[PDB]
Design a protein around this ligand. Structure first.
Ligand SMILES: CC(C)=CCN1c2cc(C)c(C)cc2N(C[C@H](O)[C@H](O)[C@H](O)COP(=O)(O)O)c2[nH]c(=O)[nH]c(=O)c21
Ligand SMILES: CC(C)=CCN1c2cc(C)c(C)cc2N(C[C@H](O)[C@H](O)[C@H](O)COP(=O)(O)O)c2[nH]c(=O)[nH]c(=O)c21
Ligand SMILES: CC(C)=CCN1c2cc(C)c(C)cc2N(C[C@H](O)[C@H](O)[C@H](O)COP(=O)(O)O)c2[nH]c(=O)[nH]c(=O)c21
Ligand SMILES: CC(C)=CCN1c2cc(C)c(C)cc2N(C[C@H](O)[C@H](O)[C@H](O)COP(=O)(O)O)c2[nH]c(=O)[nH]c(=O)c21
Ligand SMILES: CC(C)=CCN1c2cc(C)c(C)cc2N(C[C@H](O)[C@H](O)[C@H](O)COP(=O)(O)O)c2[nH]c(=O)[nH]c(=O)c21
Ligand SMILES: CC(C)=CCN1c2cc(C)c(C)cc2N(C[C@H](O)[C@H](O)[C@H](O)COP(=O)(O)O)c2[nH]c(=O)[nH]c(=O)c21
Ligand SMILES: CC(C)=CCN1c2cc(C)c(C)cc2N(C[C@H](O)[C@H](O)[C@H](O)COP(=O)(O)O)c2[nH]c(=O)[nH]c(=O)c21
Ligand SMILES: CC(C)=CCN1c2cc(C)c(C)cc2N(C[C@H](O)[C@H](O)[C@H](O)COP(=O)(O)O)c2[nH]c(=O)[nH]c(=O)c21
Ligand code: NA
Ligand code: NA
Ligand code: NA
Ligand code: NA
Ligand code: NA
Ligand code: NA
Ligand code: NA
Ligand code: NA
Lengths: 208, 208, 208, 208, 208, 208, 208, 208
């Protein structure tokens, strides 16, 4: 298996719920175990931007996402925002890679400062202290200096700052193609195979 | 007239030629004078990502863009990359707002360090020294610390760092809707009217 | 009209509820639209320091403030602390100036770090990213280095740090004169006319 | 009396509830007044790590701790997390020394940034601004750079960063001996007598 | 005696002469020796803001203040701005606490940079080098980054930055109540008893 | 084999000789090759805190530790403090992970500044330059800003700062349980299997 | 008793052995307990600059200094450079103030970086972590930026940097008067009475 | 001639007038042209610490110093504190080395910040901009962080910070020997011959 067996996927309240849902689908299809976390604000983004009717409480949410993605029983493990007995809360847990997608400016802030006010924030704090992968996918424009400083500090500490800034160099034809671009780069960063975005120049041998 | 009469629009070699072409169209439709600059790499992005067959040399390029956008004679003024007798090269010029869209990581770097190696870079240098508007629209993912530090320095100095990171909170249905999101925010930042992206919450009076 | 048409006025839990209430009154009298936000702690400051019996919930609060200030229907628009569909939550909103008066040390902190944990904090974050006015009115003594660093960062980024530190150079005769001093400086900073605090030296022509 | 008459003892959600309970016992035995604060997460640490069945609400908690420690009526004063009318919330209060034991990484963060989101955080903010003692007892491993920067900033500002890192140089024979080591150093830092940890080398007169 | 026997009280040219006069009165009433210093600009503030007719020269000023405050002969010791043979000019002097109230932005600057251009500035320089108390009471709004950086540097070095920012949480009824608030906090910072501002929450035992 | 084949284990003169001895035992049991280094001060810690009678000179020490741990001939390789012909002295050596356990404040300092005054310090210097694992286990309380800055610099450069700060969340019953906690985290950081500390939450599937 | 009961007096290898010997004499005369430490280089300074024939080994040195100063048995306690069982090596010791007089540039460096290579350096490290007094008396000219940065860092952390830079404002008539000036300032900094250097301006009441 | 032909010698108001007078004497004896500057505070130091009755005004002062030092007519050139037509005020002047001896903390500050408030300060500013020698001889103890930062900045910019901290390694027998030590180091720094302080170790050939 290339890449991590387990991914902590946290959705926070930036625009771009579709990115997180598509990533979840792809992780499931790649037979990975996903520890899924979602903020209250992200639930309201999802309701605003999609037709997904996500149940609010963890057990119902787990059953719903398992069906939605065609996952195996136990493959998607949902934890609530104060569930400190979940694996991501401790560095003594089995190792996971972590992705926050989308990453609100507020969660970016919390991670940069070490606020640890809920399980998402603590999970990121743990990832950093244990030197386990941490990928943040912010969606904001403009970025202020506040945002930039927070991203810089985290990138300097080894987090991957991967803005939801899709490329156009494969002539996207739909919204889904642009969503898939970002998801592909997340997967590439994690070392998980993907066939949505070709390997640039792989079959280019010499310059024209 | 709300907003600037003149905009220096520079296209550099990041993905997202469509953003710059759409912005040009909208500026023309808003009856603004555009001083248009394009890098060699941006010409190759445009050829790769679009069906626009842009002529290489400034005079031909000017005639072509005037036709393409339905602009008035003289409305789009194209300057070459070493044309120091063009207005954007001096702070003694009539004031323009400047947008670099898309903004490559290399142009971001040049602007941050003050390299002034061509007219785009010098134009940005001038904007900063004269405290005239400067908006950079980078398209990259991940952002490294190199990128982030350069963006931070410029944001601290009053440039607007506006990543090509479209929002989804108006349920986009096409690639064009996502392009129009970013273009709308550029226009909003410049103070130019636009009717592509509603004013959020304008008719919300009290909380539920 | 000189100055902004719309002001987001946030009250947070520092001492000096009278400053925020007086500012609200003056904004109403100047025919401005006010997007009014108040924290839970500020509600307890107001109950402790004033005889104003402010209702807790936004709709009731809106009706009460409209009566209290003699505002027009629709002139004061109250939003709750999680109301992300309110204008101040997005930079795609119509532009407002923002004042946090009083500004607790905790809200100062949140704004400086980018915490965005409620609508007040997100609104400030938006103001900074969009380069729209942001005035913070802290009331604390002593200021620690924590406070000072947070104020410095924000002032460097263009926020106005306007401490509730009234002057005595017009021989104030009451508490209200000292309240009006601070409110006058807030109005001056926003570019809104006021006749509470004279223009110093306006009719001085030469030195003695 | 050597040392402070009053100690604000805050327990937050790091591992090591035993340290805070032992410190409380020792402070009581030294006839000090304790203003006791505990976070929601710390209540769940205490339930997980000890057999102490602490009641949730302040009045019940006060009665329970008074009995548990053999304190005098009024000696332990419990305040809830939003009780701004408690002494620690204002610098106009009678002076107390403050100890956060254990200190979670999240509370460390809040104190470093000035978040003031509850009474513990505000109490620490007050201690710093008034230059009153503040001792933080973090329990984490590894420490990331996030943690380290926060500790460094606070130590530079005069807080004592006292990690729950017991020494072995008095040949500890039980868990309690290691708990007592840390508690002894806290007491020493506060200037409160203790006879758990000898004064190193006190009766050494010259080198061998 | 709690607190310092001797206080160097310097008045500089910020608004708020009443704060310095009230502090002087309270120090006298607490039987402290005061080494009183006043800048030329502060003399013009006092004449503008009060009805106190302070004589210009030190001997006359000393006699006048002694009468005004009901001080003992020798209790108030006035030194001129170039009087290097006064105690505050040398760290070999008997120890004093020092308060600059009000503290102009210019004196704040001088202290931060070490300018030592007159006895007030040198006295502060001495306080810092000898690690003797130094309290600055600035009165300005807005604070620029210039002001903030200067205050930050000094707070980091152990000075107390105590802005003339009175609280309202004891329902002040007059200007004098607001003056007394600030003076009370100065006295509290110095460790001198005062009965103008109650000890917050002293008789609160448990949360509601 | 998961984790490194070879570990350079350096013991320096902080309290907590038991941690280093237990780690050595566990590494031996996991069939790893250990390049063992010990400072003069650490030898005096070991004699003070344990009943282990460690011989002073490398050959005798090697024979003694081999017996003590039940190691294979050649499995523990002891090098003296000036033995520059030992593998850890050069980056051209076969790769090892390095652990300094316990890590004195003086060795922390030396590593942070690059002092390279003995083989332990040079070995760490090499680890950093070659980007090979380096784990420091300090035992000190309080940590001063000196200590914190040194730890911060090293953590920023990729070293793991793992304080000897055991957790209590598995209800330790002896000193050995607390020693084993820290050793388990060291092993986890190195990627070496251990069964002393469970994987937190591994069999938790959804929130309560 | 004003000032500390115990002083750790370390002599290191800067010029000015007379300062350290005079300080020792004065501390003895003030009935203080002195924990005396001396570096190898300082022994060679003392032999070069004075006629004091100090024995090399701690026991002999203790007997010699006791006689030389007319101290009580037990009043001067000499510890060798590796004597970790001496009080100054641990923060669990009874509190002492510490003076390094003279302070070589190398010891200044060691203290600033936290090197802890001998008992003097460790003792200083302990003083800083425990927030106990630490006074360094460097003697060097010029000071390089290396020296200055080290002094700055330590002064920022609360150490007193007291250069052997005697004043002339009491018209010194001998070398001993200049030695006594510096010793007097050390004593003043520690809060120990001295009658060598008058209190400047004590009997000055008003300006001329 | 080794060393500069012309020296700007400024005396400012630190203790140690004897150092500046002795330096002046030695410069005269070495046949150098001296541009002599003295502050008002330095005149009061000189009157306090010496029996030199220096006239206040430049012409009288010039005649007096010429006699006092046995200088040639024209050799000592005195300029007043506002004499901008003197050579040291412009970098277009013939080059001089500059020494400020003694250097008050206030003049140190002015030089570090660039205040240029009188001819001494402007002269130093000029020296720095022209990269001409600048030696500052401060006399203060303790040095605060204010002082240290100012000295550090200037040393980093190439000024020589030469504290009036005499050495004892040539067994000084009088105050004059200690004065001559500092003066000798100033002369050495300037490259002017002196025979007061031997060249250390010049006739040492090998180690003992
Ligand atoms: C159109 C509005 C109001 C903003 C665009 N977008 C967004 C869309 C929708 C539809 C909602 C509701 C909210 C957002 N926000 C704001 C955000 O959720 C909040 O600041 C919030 O406190 C974040 O908390 P968490 O970190 O999730 O715990 C948010 N935050 C952000 O960083 N980027 C975004 O794109 C947006
Ligand atoms: C798929 C590749 C090779 C990259 C995606 N994209 C891009 C697409 C295409 C199709 C081409 C050709 C080039 C890019 N680049 C690279 C970029 O043009 C260069 O670094 C270049 O030096 C920039 O110079 P200028 O600043 O314009 O003068 C570039 N640079 C950047 O910052 N962002 C991008 O999205 C991309
Ligand atoms: C006399 C006390 C307890 C303090 C004076 N004053 C104040 C008065 C009253 C009467 C109450 C109740 C609270 C305060 N506080 C504390 C403050 O509200 C809190 O830190 C709180 O978390 C702020 O949260 P928000 O930012 O509003 O969400 C507060 N905070 C602050 O920055 N400045 C103040 O003046 C005071
Ligand atoms: C075994 C786990 C999940 C961690 C070890 N330990 C701990 C034990 C237990 C059993 C629980 C439940 C929680 C922790 N935590 C996490 C911590 O409580 C939270 O981040 C929390 O948000 C802190 O909030 P507060 O600052 O108290 O308001 C925590 N935080 C920390 O800084 N150090 C710790 O030792 C641990
Ligand atoms: C209404 C005006 C002109 C300002 C309000 N106020 C003030 C009132 C009055 C009535 C006078 C005359 C002067 C002030 N100033 C300016 C200040 O005195 C000067 O900058 C001055 O150089 C200070 O020198 P010092 O530090 O005292 O030596 C001053 N400076 C300051 O920091 N805060 C103030 O409140 C004011
Ligand atoms: C109870 C005393 C004197 C201190 C507790 N402990 C300790 C215990 C014992 C019993 C001895 C003997 C020494 C220590 N030290 C001091 C330390 O060994 C020294 O600073 C030394 O120079 C370190 O050199 P190395 O880096 O090993 O080369 C030391 N240093 C440290 O960082 N942490 C400790 O816990 C302690
Ligand atoms: C005339 C010489 C060679 C220098 C003047 N003086 C001095 C005098 C004598 C006569 C000796 C022998 C040595 C010095 N030194 C150098 C110093 O001792 C060393 O750098 C040494 O390593 C210091 O180690 P420690 O910190 O004591 O462990 C030294 N160091 C210093 O900082 N200031 C001094 O004044 C002098
Ligand atoms: C015993 C006193 C009051 C101090 C010791 N000494 C000194 C002695 C005498 C006897 C006088 C009168 C003054 C000083 N001072 C203070 C100093 O002159 C002033 O700060 C002054 O503003 C300096 O201005 P300039 O830079 O010369 O323009 C001063 N300043 C300084 O940096 N170092 C000193 O040694 C002393
Ligand atoms: Na928290
Ligand atoms: Na160039
Ligand atoms: Na948040
Ligand atoms: Na808050
Ligand atoms: Na001056
Ligand atoms: Na070395
Ligand atoms: Na060492
Ligand atoms: Na000037």
């Amino acid at each position: 298996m290339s890449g991590p067996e387990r991914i902590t996927l946290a959705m926070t309240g930036a625009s771009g719920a579709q990115y997180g849902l598509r990533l979840l689908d792809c992780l499931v299809q790649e037979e990975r175990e996903v520890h899924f976390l979602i903020s209250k604000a992200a639930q309201l983004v999802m309701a605003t931007e999609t037709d997904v009717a996500l149940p609010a409480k963890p057990q119902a949410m787990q059953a719903f996402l398992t069906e939605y993605c065609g996952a195996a029983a136990g493959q998607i493990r949902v934890f609530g925002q104060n569930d400190w007995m979940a694996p991501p809360a401790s560095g003594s847990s089995a190792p996971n890679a972590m992705v926050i997608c989308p990453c609100s400016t507020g969660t970016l802030s919390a991670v940069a400062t070490g606020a640890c006010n809920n399980l998402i924030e603590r999970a990121a704090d743990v990832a950093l202290k244990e030197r386990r992968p941490l990928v943040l996918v912010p969606r904001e424009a403009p970025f202020s200096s506040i945002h930039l400083e927070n991203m810089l500090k985290l990138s300097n500490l080894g987090a991957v700052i991967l803005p939801a800034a899709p490329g156009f160099y494969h002539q996207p034809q739909s919204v889904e193609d642009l969503v898939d671009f970002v998801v592909a780069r997340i997967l590439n960063t994690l070392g998980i195979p993907q066939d949505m975005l070709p390997r640039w120049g792989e079959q280019h041998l010499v310059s024209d």
